[PDB]
Amino acid sequence: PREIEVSEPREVGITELVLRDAHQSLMATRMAMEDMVGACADIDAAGYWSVECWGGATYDSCIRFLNEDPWERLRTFRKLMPNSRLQMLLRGQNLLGYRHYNDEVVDRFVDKSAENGMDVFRVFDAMNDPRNMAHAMAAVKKAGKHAQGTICYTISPVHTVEGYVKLAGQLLDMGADSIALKDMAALLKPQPAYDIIKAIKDTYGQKTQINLHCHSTTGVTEVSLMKAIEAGVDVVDTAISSMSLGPGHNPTESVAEMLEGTGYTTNLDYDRLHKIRDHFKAIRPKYKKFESKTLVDTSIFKSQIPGGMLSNMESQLRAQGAEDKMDEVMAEVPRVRKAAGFPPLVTPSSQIVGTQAVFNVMMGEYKRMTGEFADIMLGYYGASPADRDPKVVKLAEEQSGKKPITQRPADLLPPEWEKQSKEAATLKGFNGTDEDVLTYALFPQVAPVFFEHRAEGPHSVALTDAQLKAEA
Amino acid sequence: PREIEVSEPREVGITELVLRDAHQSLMATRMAMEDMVGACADIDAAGYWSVECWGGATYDSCIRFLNEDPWERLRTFRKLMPNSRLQMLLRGQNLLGYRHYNDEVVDRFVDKSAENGMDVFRVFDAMNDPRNMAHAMAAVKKAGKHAQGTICYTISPVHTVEGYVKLAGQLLDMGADSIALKDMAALLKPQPAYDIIKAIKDTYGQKTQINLHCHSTTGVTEVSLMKAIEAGVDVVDTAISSMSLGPGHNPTESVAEMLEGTGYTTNLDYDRLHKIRDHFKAIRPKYKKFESKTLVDTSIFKSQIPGGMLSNMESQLRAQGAEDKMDEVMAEVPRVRKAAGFPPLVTPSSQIVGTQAVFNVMMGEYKRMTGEFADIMLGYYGASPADRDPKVVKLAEEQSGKKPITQRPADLLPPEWEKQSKEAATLKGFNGTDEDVLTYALFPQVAPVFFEHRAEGPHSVALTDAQLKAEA
Ligand SMILES: [Co+2]
Ligand SMILES: [Co+2]
């Protein structure tokens, strides 16, 4: 017999993800505002620490598929849930866009987000480079909001508990009000969850607020949440049960109920949770055309490849002809990842590494490198967790003609707000607000079409009751 | 800071449920033998402690829907998995049938099961009355096989840790080689799992073998499995990941992977598991017409009513007309359950209590009692966990004309083997074996039709590839 030290009896906070990450992960971010507003009053009174409802891929989805202004959605959520802490996911210097922006664009985006109601900003970087998060977080502090620095969890030869403890320290040094451990691929197992949370708390103090964000893709993370709570985690992210599991998240009600008698508890109102659950249970069937077909996939623990990346490369192998080389492409991913400095395999790094892996198997090793892969190797996306392969770096410079850099990429970007503002002002439909200039700066190719059709009002791409009933 | 005592580092055994409980729970027990045999070689070499592949509702499904002889399925499994411990679920004195049988029928069934290859017999009773399990377990010991006495876990005012420890002792006293904690409704939370397993081990010794069987219906039991392992559980039941979650069970691969670095481990071969997973992933879509629509339901923690029982009563309220009394029927279930002595709400007790609850709301309190409810109240199903309501008992006697009993029901049953054998021998198709007489004794109304069509060979009720592709 042995013993395990566990935290003192206490309340654990819960962050609800149904309005953002749950539908992004389970139904391609297609959830229409019309299908969510009806649950806002109950969500607002359920007792959550925060409600994630903006950022991530929802900005793109609003203007590209739902003809909806993302800023109007944020204003509506602020109005319908006046007593809640609203939370968003922001990818640092890239904001919600496709590239790094000059510091002034980051300042304006954060300022308008805060002005329109955002309370908690979860700032992250796909390569875990703190320098890419530094300016956005300073802007959040300037706005007087809560800055949550994020650490993307991954498994690799260079990622260790000591490495995560070091990263947490760098985030606290740049003003983070809290630290978020983000496990998008559900790779965080129970013992590592306990060990990392405990090491951060022991090193920086019990006052260090840590929020754990785990998906349920591999089926092991609800046990990780329990171990994280024993290690002292302050808040855990979950999704209402009718919109949970699979590539999504662990169920809110299940996480609350499992704590009975352990000394830990949540302050969630079960009656409100039941109403929220029933609300989405009635709406989810309309999104069947966008659902995934796998509830549990643990293959990543061996292959390091997330199912979303795997099927993606598979489509590239068929449309290319030789798909009988899938087993070869999978053995190549680890090699490419290593060459790139072992970055976490989350969007967009995953698509980039996967594509380069397919190219190496097709036209030979680094014979043809995508422009994005070349940029990673040359440092235009920031620093990697480990040193990149000098041999491959050299090849990237000889194919791109760009010189390798090691300093924060945005240091080289010139002011661009005036240029963005002038170009945006020439599009039919532009309403003159900084919000619209931001939409143009973030999605130049979609902004034109959106501005022209926005007046029609938001639409839904979900099946109608008639179509649903017509299918049965 | 506090501490929790956990068991010493050790290997935890795993029982695979894909061949029996997984499809019984997820696709109405309709899995065709043709769709399972292809995975037997891999299952046999995966390293499981046992493979559940018989008993439960599969006997009924074979002869009622698949025109398959259950004894041929058992023989086939024995031949294709020669190195594995085969396991079945047997409902004590009721065997796999609809009523209590005379001791001689129980003796013959167990003898033929053992003769045809069964290794582990999980014997249980829906009301947790050990007397109804006693004879079947003696028959298992006579056959030299492994007798696993079962405790059905439930939550009620009269169920306590001390009560379960007492039951475990009674099972060990009647020769149990191991104790199974069966949680069909997924009501077992983490702390209770730890407390009960620890109390049994502390009271009867670390040598006491305990197997935990939890469904994943409420979404909290994988954490319960982890706590049960910390408390010292010897074996846990799981289902291959492509046939898991929902009303089913926690994923085999997820349970094995979550233990990395905790000091606990399993001896499962991940490559074999991957092959089994892929096998069923390709077959499951063909059974879509029999799938359920809810992955997680925690309402039972408040209502004591399992979703399978809830929807069932709902159908009775509509086909009856007044379904606007559903909220009244749900408040009645607890009252009826209490009157019956708080039996666990598992089949068949659940359907019985649910029906009587609907009757009380319709024609008044116990105005009209079903014959089955009357039998429970009068003791013809055995003793209840708590004392039954004398007032309701009296009413049952005045409506059935039967006198209340308190001794084991089978004590009153006369020899019946010769009578069963003669009647069975008059049916066209009867092959003269004791196995066929057992089929007739267990399912008198289906045996005639089955014996006449068995020669056509087993069929499948799943969609064909053509029908599947035709639907897409
Ligand atoms: Co996420
Ligand atoms: Co079961």
Integer Cα distance of B133 and B179 in angstroms: 13
B226 near A CB under 8 A: yes
Cα A152 to chain center, whole Å?
9
CB distance B190 to A226 below 8 Å: yes
Question: What is the number of helices (H) and of strands (E) in chain A?
Answer: 21, 11
Measured between beta carbons, which residues in chain A are less than 8 angstroms from residue B311?
Answer: none
Of B8, B226, B297, the CB nearest to A190: B226
Measured between beta carbons, which residues in chain A are less than 8 angstroms from residue B224?
Answer: 258
State the amino acid at position A443 in one-letter form.
F
Measured between beta carbons, which residues in chain B are less than 8 angstroms from residue A224?
Answer: 258
What are the phi and psi torsion angles at B229 (to 5°)? -70, -40
A274 near B CB under 8 A: yes
Q: How far apart are the CA of B277 and the centre of ligand 2, in A?
A: 20
Q: List binding-site positions of B.
A: 20-24, 57, 182, 213, 215
Integer Cα distance of A285 and A468 in angstroms: 8
CB distance A215 to A249 below 8 Å: yes
Integer Cα distance of A338 and A331 in angstroms: 12
Q: Residue B412 has what DSSP assignment? A: G
Beta strands in B176-218 (DSSP E): 178-183, 210-214
Annotate A131-151 with three-state secondary structure. Answer: HHHHHHHHHHHHCCCEEEEEE
b/e sequence B17-35, b meaning 16+ C-beta within 10 Å: bbbbbbbbbbbbbbbbbeb
CB distance A247 to A26 below 8 Å: yes
Among the bound ligands, the one closest to the CA of B347: 2
Give, in order, the Cα–Cα distances in Å from B377 to each of A433, B155, B374: 74, 20, 5
Integer Cα distance of B284 and B243 in angstroms: 8
Integer Cα distance of B468 and A5 in angstroms: 53
* Residues whose CB falls within 8 Å of the CB of residue A455, separated by 6 or more in sequence, listed in order: A429
The reply, when asked if residue A207 is annotated as ligand binding, is: no
b/e sequence A172-198, b meaning 16+ C-beta within 10 Å: bebebbbbbbbbbbbbbbbbbbbbbbb
Task: List the one residue out of B384, B383, B401, B404 whose CA is nearest residue B393.
Answer: B404
Beta strands in A91-168 (DSSP E): 120-123, 146-152
* Residues whose CB falls within 8 Å of the CB of residue B38, separated by 6 or more in sequence, listed in order: B279
B220 near A CB under 8 A: yes
Q: How far apart are the CA of A418 and the centre of ligand 1, in A?
A: 34
* Residues whose CB falls within 8 Å of the CB of residue A318, separated by 6 or more in sequence, listed in order: none
Q: Residue B306 has what DSSP assignment? A: -
DSSP SS3 for A123: strand
Among the bound ligands, the one closest to the CA of A52: 1
Plot region of A342 (φ>0 → left; ψ -120 to 50 → alpha; else → beta): left
Q: How far apart are the CA of A21 and the centre of ligand 1, in A?
A: 6
Stretch 157-216 of chain A: residues touching chain B, C-beta under 8 Å: 189-192
What are the phi and psi torsion angles at A181 (to 5°)? -100, 110
Stretch 283-302 of chain A: residues touching chain B, C-beta under 8 Å: 294-299, 301-302
DSSP SS3 for A72: helix
In chain A, which residue's Cα lies nearest the Cα of B250? A219
Plot region of A420 (φ>0 → left; ψ -120 to 50 → alpha; else → beta): alpha
Stretch 382-441 of chain B: residues touching chain A, C-beta under 8 Å: none
Integer Cα distance of A103 and A415 in angstroms: 8
* Residues whose CB falls within 8 Å of the CB of residue B278, separated by 6 or more in sequence, listed in order: B242
Integer Cα distance of B44 and B49 in angstroms: 10
DSSP SS3 for B78: helix
Burial class (CB in 10 A: 0-12, 13-18, 19+), B422: exposed
**CATH numeric code, A9-292:** 3.20.20.70
DSSP conformation letters of A218-280: TS-HHHHHHHHHHTT-SEEEEB-GGG-STTSB-BHHHHHHTTTTSSEE----HHHHHHHHHHH
* Residues whose CB falls within 8 Å of the CB of residue B268, separated by 6 or more in sequence, listed in order: B14, B46, B47, B48, B252, B256
For residue A217 the two structure tokens come to 């893709």
Q: Do residue B241 and residue A295 have CB atoms under 8 angstroms apart?
A: yes
For residue B76 the two structure tokens come to 């086939």
Q: List binding-site positions of B for substrate.
A: 20-24, 57, 182
Q: Do residue B301 and residue A257 have CB atoms under 8 angstroms apart?
A: yes
Integer Cα distance of B384 and B328 in angstroms: 25
Among the bound ligands, the one closest to the CA of B250: 2
Q: Do residue A190 and residue B244 have CB atoms under 8 angstroms apart?
A: no
Integer Cα distance of A155 and B70 in angstroms: 47
Domain layout of chain A by residue ranges: 9-292, 293-472
Task: Give the residue carrying structure tokens 């129980």.
Answer: B106
Among the bound ligands, the one closest to the CA of B181: 2
Integer Cα distance of B76 and B86 in angstroms: 12
Question: What is the number of helices (H) and of strands (E) in chain B?
Answer: 21, 11
DSSP SS3 for A351: helix
Beta-sheet pairing, B2-6 with A2-6: antiparallel
Integer Cα distance of A110 and A118 in angstroms: 9
Measured between beta carbons, which residues in chain B are less than 8 angstroms from residue A5?
Answer: 1-3
What are the phi and psi torsion angles at B453 (to 5°)? -110, -10
Q: Residue A7 has what DSSP assignment? A: P
- Exposure of A196 in the CB half-sphere (CA atoms within 13 A): 32
> This structure's resolution (angstroms)?
1.9
What are the phi and psi torsion angles at A189 (to 5°)? -85, 165
- Exposure of A70 in the CB half-sphere (CA atoms within 13 A): 32
CB distance B244 to A296 below 8 Å: yes
Task: Give the residue carrying structure tokens 């691929």.
Answer: A185
Between CA A186 and CA B252, with CA A351 as vertex, the angle to 5 degrees is: 30
Stretch 240-269 of chain B: residues touching chain A, C-beta under 8 Å: 241-242, 244-245, 250-251, 253-254, 257-263
Structure determination method: X-ray
* Residues whose CB falls within 8 Å of the CB of residue A239, separated by 6 or more in sequence, listed in order: A16, A17, A18, A21, A22, A248, A249, A250, A251, A252
b/e sequence B199-210, b meaning 16+ C-beta within 10 Å: bbbeeeeeebbb
